[PDB]
Design a protein around this ligand. Structure first.
Ligand SMILES: CCCCCCCC/C=C/CCCCCCCC(=O)O[C@@H](COC(=O)CCCCCCCCCCCCCCC)COP(=O)([O-])OCC[N+](C)(C)C
Ligand SMILES: CCCCCCCC/C=C/CCCCCCCC(=O)O[C@@H](COC(=O)CCCCCCCCCCCCCCC)COP(=O)([O-])OCC[N+](C)(C)C
Ligand SMILES: CCCCCCCC/C=C/CCCCCCCC(=O)O[C@@H](COC(=O)CCCCCCCCCCCCCCC)COP(=O)([O-])OCC[N+](C)(C)C
Ligand SMILES: CCCCCCCC/C=C/CCCCCCCC(=O)O[C@@H](COC(=O)CCCCCCCCCCCCCCC)COP(=O)([O-])OCC[N+](C)(C)C
Ligand SMILES: CCCCCCCC/C=C\CCCCCCCC(=O)O[C@@H](COC(=O)CCCCCCCCCCCCCCC)COP(=O)([O-])OCC[N+](C)(C)C
Ligand SMILES: *[C@@H]1O[C@H](CO)[C@@H](O[C@@H]2O[C@H](CO)[C@@H](O[C@@H]3O[C@H](CO)[C@@H](O)[C@H](O[C@@H]4O[C@H](CO)[C@@H](O)[C@H](O)[C@@H]4O)[C@@H]3O)[C@H](O)[C@H]2NC(C)=O)[C@H](O)[C@H]1NC(C)=O
Ligand SMILES: O=S1(=O)NCN(C2CC2)c2ccc(F)cc21
Ligand SMILES: C=C(C)[C@H]1CN[C@H](C(=O)O)[C@H]1CC(=O)O
Ligand SMILES: C=C(C)[C@H]1CN[C@H](C(=O)O)[C@H]1CC(=O)O
Ligand SMILES: *[C@@H]1O[C@H](CO)[C@@H](O)[C@H](O)[C@H]1NC(C)=O
Lengths: 319, 152, 50, 51
């Protein structure tokens, strides 16, 4: 129901109510549609039109699903209406069934969390970081609204959500329901070689690594220039390329498949079974309104109904 | 038979025998379907229903395969069964012929490797060479960092 | 006739139905299994034509 | 085919795409750290970009 936008599904449903209206209007005062009944006539004085409002809307619904109706218009003014409604329903369906190739594939869910905002407001996904790292200490000293909520949670449960290594964190994302707050560079490795893990969110802060020197050591400045030396030559990019790239988890494309099931198609059988139950109710409506029309000649409601009820039981009545 | 799963082919046939029996019950229960089959003959109050059970299946089978049938519903209670079976079989045929395009144009079978760096990343398929040939001696002296991993 | 039986085979092949539909269930199964033939031949044609 | 083509793709999507395609011309700022990066590079993608 997606390959046309939800205003197109309303504009083609108002077009059926629009064209079947203007077909009903034209067919009444076109003097060439009023034909002759009685195929064995004494040549007339009776003109009978076959465009009622029930039959004009059956032409609009008939010529929309490509199964043509029992009546085709005479009287050229009503053939141009039928001739331009056919070109409408040709283009609507040929645009539908040519766009349906893309919309006929199910796609994965979005995660329940999508940032540190969505993950602060929940209690279902537990979350924590490595105890005594630079990540726990970031939330311990923070004062901003979202990242203080995420430490009010961790300090209440600092035995259960705060793992003591990254490998105890990555296994608990796997073997439980848990969102672990790493550094950005380790996630760029783990989510490559493992293919069930992803980086939910963007970077919370920005900070970097560094060769630590004692406070006053001159090897601070000699590696300061030296780290810049490998960078403009492209060695820091070359070493990072060699280790953080692995088996890329390339399974995103994965066409190869997808016979349609009760997942994909799945829902016409709902709007089929909701259309037949609708039709049983208007079979009761015709059963009563004709019996109340027969009640304009005789008794109130019950005698006219039970005679029509008993002839239906014989299944072969044929008066 | 592939572009619909083998349960959906058993839900179409249970709808094609389902709707075509619901159309049969409503058509003999509706009083507007019963007409006088003598327009030019004012003879008597003869009534005739076109919907026998074998004509009711033929509407559900005829409209399932886009060809249409000899009979057409006349009462409003049977134009809604007939009107919603057309929309059912419009989308089933449009879902079949749009996914049948996908099964006819996929590929033969592609190997998981197509190069050396494809087999440098994918450590599922294992390497090989000959002991003391010029193949392993090429990787033993290389440092190009694609072939260095291939000796690693 | 033989003229009308071959017009049913050509009529039900181009999806524009003919003026006559069979009665007599033995001739409806022929029409019912020729329709499934011409459905699959065209749905394989127009899906390969891209 | 007309409903599923693409928006409009640029003829370049990287630096080596603009290293091969010599129809669209390069640029930088005179005496910045951008041209000084290519002046000292030898990675043979960025060497052509200074060539
Ligand atoms: C296969 C199905 C066959 C269907 C039947 C045969 C169909 C024959 C159709 C022929 C169209 C011929 C025009 C050439 C089309 C090319 C583009 C063009 O020129 O369109 C132009 C307008 O042109 C129109 O608007 C045409 C409108 C066609 C209506 C046809 C109704 C007939 C229905 C039957 C009547 C029943 C009577 C019954 C009597 C008993 C617009 O061009 P553009 O794209 O905007 O370019 C500008 C692009 N730019 C904006 C970027 C600058
Ligand atoms: C859960 C809800 C259940 C409702 C239960 C309660 C409902 C109760 C039912 C009520 C109505 C049925 C009984 C009364 C009318 C009798 C039928 C009839 O044909 O007569 C008239 C109706 O002619 C019309 O005006 C048809 C109305 C428009 C047709 C399209 C309606 C929308 C389609 C639906 C899609 C919208 C979906 C809506 C949202 C889902 C005219 O015909 P006639 O003049 O009598 O002809 C006699 C023949 N003769 C002259 C040869 C003798
Ligand atoms: C052509 C003009 C006619 C237009 C009429 C139709 C316009 C109507 C447009 C309605 C648009 C409404 C938009 C929002 C609706 C939300 C409801 C929803 O959730 O989906 C609901 C489905 O919905 C149905 O089942 C409706 C079926 C319609 C049957 C009527 C056919 C009339 C045929 C006319 C014949 C004409 C013959 C001519 C007669 C002379 C429920 O879905 P769910 O909640 O998922 O429940 C599933 C249970 N589950 C959760 C376990 C999975
Ligand atoms: C959308 C259009 C709807 C059409 C209508 C509904 C269609 C209903 C269809 C239902 C088919 C149900 C079978 C499931 C299909 C899955 C695969 C399968 O099982 O096929 C198997 C055989 O199966 C057959 O041969 C089925 C034959 C279907 C004939 C239907 C004719 C009805 C026409 C109407 C009658 C007119 C009567 C008129 C009366 C008035 C073969 O499987 P395979 O692939 O070989 O697997 C082996 C693979 N391997 C070799 C690699 C090891
Ligand atoms: C009348 C009898 C009763 C009918 C009842 C049933 C009928 C029910 C009918 C419709 C029901 C629903 C209506 C919704 C859509 C219709 C309008 C529309 O929006 O389309 C277009 C209008 O955009 C334009 O380009 C305007 C051009 C107007 C031309 C003249 C229109 C009248 C034609 C008479 C000529 C007479 C000459 C021939 C004489 C022989 C597109 O809108 P847009 O958003 O602007 O486009 C996207 C913008 N973008 C391109 C930047 C991306
Ligand atoms: C689809 O997604 C589901 C939603 O997360 C997921 O369901 C989870 O699965 C894990 C196991 O994979 C469940 O973990 C269990 O929890 C206890 C701790 O309380 C675990 O100790 C235990 O076994 C663990 O599971 C390892 C496999 O991952 C196993 O090797 C070890 O033995 C280890 O001890 C339980 O299995 C978790 O509760 C599930 N969550 C929910 C909400 O159900 C599905 O696995 C996943 N499916 C696939 C195919 O990816
Ligand atoms: O911790 S730092 O030395 N100073 C702070 N910043 C920038 C503010 C983001 C950055 C940004 C990237 C780094 F690699 C390091 C640092
Ligand atoms: C059969 C062996 C070991 C020889 C044959 N030619 C190569 C050579 O003589 O160097 C080797 C093959 C190889 O490198 O895999
Ligand atoms: C505006 C100029 C020349 C400066 C601004 N920052 C860089 C710098 O100061 O190194 C230059 C931009 C560049 O490299 O394109
Ligand atoms: C991802 O899903 C489950 C959970 O571990 C496992 O069976 C599957 O092998 C995993 N895939 C990879 C590549 O680890």
């Amino acid at each position: 129901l997606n390959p046309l936008s939800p205003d197109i599904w309303m504009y083609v449903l108002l077009a059926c109510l629009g064209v079947s209206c203007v077909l009903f209007v034209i067919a009444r005062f076109s003097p060439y549609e009023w034909y002759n009944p009685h195929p064995c006539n004494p040549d007339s004085d009776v003109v009978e039109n076959n465009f009622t409002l029930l039959n004009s809307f059956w032409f609009g619904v008939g010529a929309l699903m490509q199964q043509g109706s029992e009546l085709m218009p005479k009287a050229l003014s009503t053939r141009i209406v039928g001739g331009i409604w056919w070109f409408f329903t040709l283009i609507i369906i040929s645009s539908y069934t040519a766009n349906l190739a893309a919309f006929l594939t199910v796609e994965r869910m979005e995660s329940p969390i999508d940032s540190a905002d969505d993950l602060a407001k929940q209690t279902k996904i537990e979350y924590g970081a490595v105890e005594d790292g630079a990540t726990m200490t970031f939330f311990k000293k923070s004062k901003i609204s979202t990242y203080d909520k995420m430490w009010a949670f961790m300090s209440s449960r600092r035995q259960s959500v705060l793992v003591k290594s990254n490998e105890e964190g990555i296994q608990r994302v796997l073997t439980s329901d848990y969102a672990f707050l790493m550094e950005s560079t380790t996630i760029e490795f783990v989510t490559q070689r493992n293919c069930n893990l992803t980086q939910i969110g963007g970077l919370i802060d920005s900070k970097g690594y560094g060769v630590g020197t004692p406070m006053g050591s001159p090897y601070r400045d000699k590696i300061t220039i030296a780290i810049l030396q490998l960078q403009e030559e492209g060695k820091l990019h070359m070493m990072k390329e060699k280790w953080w790239r692995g088996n890329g988890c390339p399974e995103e494309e994965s066409k190869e498949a997808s016979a349609l099931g009760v997942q994909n198609i799945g829902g016409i059988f709902i709007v089929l079974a909701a259309g037949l139950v609708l039709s049983v109710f208007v079979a009761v409506g015709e059963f009563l309104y004709k019996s109340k029309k027969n009640a304009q000649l005789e008794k109130r409601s019950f005698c006219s109904a039970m005679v029509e009820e008993l002839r239906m039981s014989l299944k072969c009545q044929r008066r």
